[PDB]
């Protein structure tokens, strides 16, 4: 009946849950607490030419 089963947040060194949506608007849903994506190079290396970090930065 339109059920979503997904894993729970655990640690490392029965583990999943179930969700059903009841309302007609997507703004009524719960938060998206499980999206983990990264992209630091947008702010840390915004340069036109690549720098390989083992060669001198200039010359």
């Amino acid at each position: 009946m339109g059920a979503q089963v997904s894993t729970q947040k655990t640690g490392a060194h029965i583990i999943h849950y179930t969700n059903i949506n009841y309302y007609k608007d997507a703004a009524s849903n719960s938060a998206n607490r499980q999206d983990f994506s990264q992209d630091p190079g947008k702010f840390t290396e915004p340069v036109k030419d690549i720098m390989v970090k083992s060669l001198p930065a200039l010359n």
Binding site: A27, S30, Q38, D39, P40, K42, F43, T44
Partner: protein, 238 residues
């Protein structure tokens, strides 16, 4: 209808919950999405950017740009330390208002290694060499170069490349440290010394400045969200 039973925690308002809720504007058509540059997905992306450190936070210079410059001159000064401070990225006065420091003050636990970049801002005719040393906790701060050379150090030579990186590695008995640091979660300290001195030709200034930037490495993480102690009000309308 269906027989049910109410459990403890019913009819309470917890701030950190997330349940579904009824919408007050049914079938509302939102504006389309625009592709704007500079999207952020994780606060750790901000802490990985360098920012200038106010190392010269002495009395009388708290409101001038001189708070950012480390002075260094020519002549025989091998016995006088250049600078030194504690590694407390969220508690010490020299770090708590930087980007990394301001991000950490929203959390309670931190872990990972740090990067300190140093740039020399003298003339092109000046030369010199410096020793940058990090000491893990367990003893007092080194009071000479002979003592400082025993820890994790780098010898920086000034040339065409003007910047040198000192990486402070994660060396701890626990997996995390407190942003509000005590004796038990100490991290050590950092010091700077002359390795050979500064030599200039005739016609150049004899005094120079060094600047320091701080950032986090790619093994850095924080946890246990909390409120920050820097902002406050006494009434509404502020």
């Amino acid at each position: 209808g269906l027989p049910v039973m109410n459990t403890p925690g019913s009819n309470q308002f917890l701030t950190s919950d997330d349940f579904q809720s009824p919408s007050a504007m049914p079938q509302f058509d939102v504006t389309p999405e625009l592709n704007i540059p500079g999207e952020v997905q994780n606060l750790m992306e901000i802490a990985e950017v360098d920012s200038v450190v106010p190392v010269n936070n002495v009395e009388g210079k708290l409101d001038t740009m001189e708070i950012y410059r480390i002075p260094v001159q020519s002549g025989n000064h091998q016995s006088s330390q250049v600078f030194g401070f504690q590694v407390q990225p969220g508690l010490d006065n020299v770090f708590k208002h930087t980007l990394l420091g301001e991000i950490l003050n929203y959390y309670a636990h931190w872990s990972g290694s740090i990067k300190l970049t140093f740039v020399f801002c003298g003339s092109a005719m000046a030369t010199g060499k410096f020793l940058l040393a990090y000491a893990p906790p367990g003893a007092n701060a080194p009071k000479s170069r002979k003592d400082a050379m025993l820890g994790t150090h780098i010898i920086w030579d000034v040339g065409l490349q003007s910047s040198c990186v000192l990486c402070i590695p994660w060396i701890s008995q626990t997996h995390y440290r407190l942003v509000q640091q005590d004796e038990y979660t100490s991290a050590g300290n950092v010091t700077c010394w002359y390795q050979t001195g500064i030599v200039v030709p005739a016609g150049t200034p004899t005094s120079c400045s060094i600047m320091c930037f701080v950032s986090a490495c790619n093994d850095f993480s924080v946890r246990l969200l909390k409120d920050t102690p820097f902002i406050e009000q006494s009434a509404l309308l502020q």
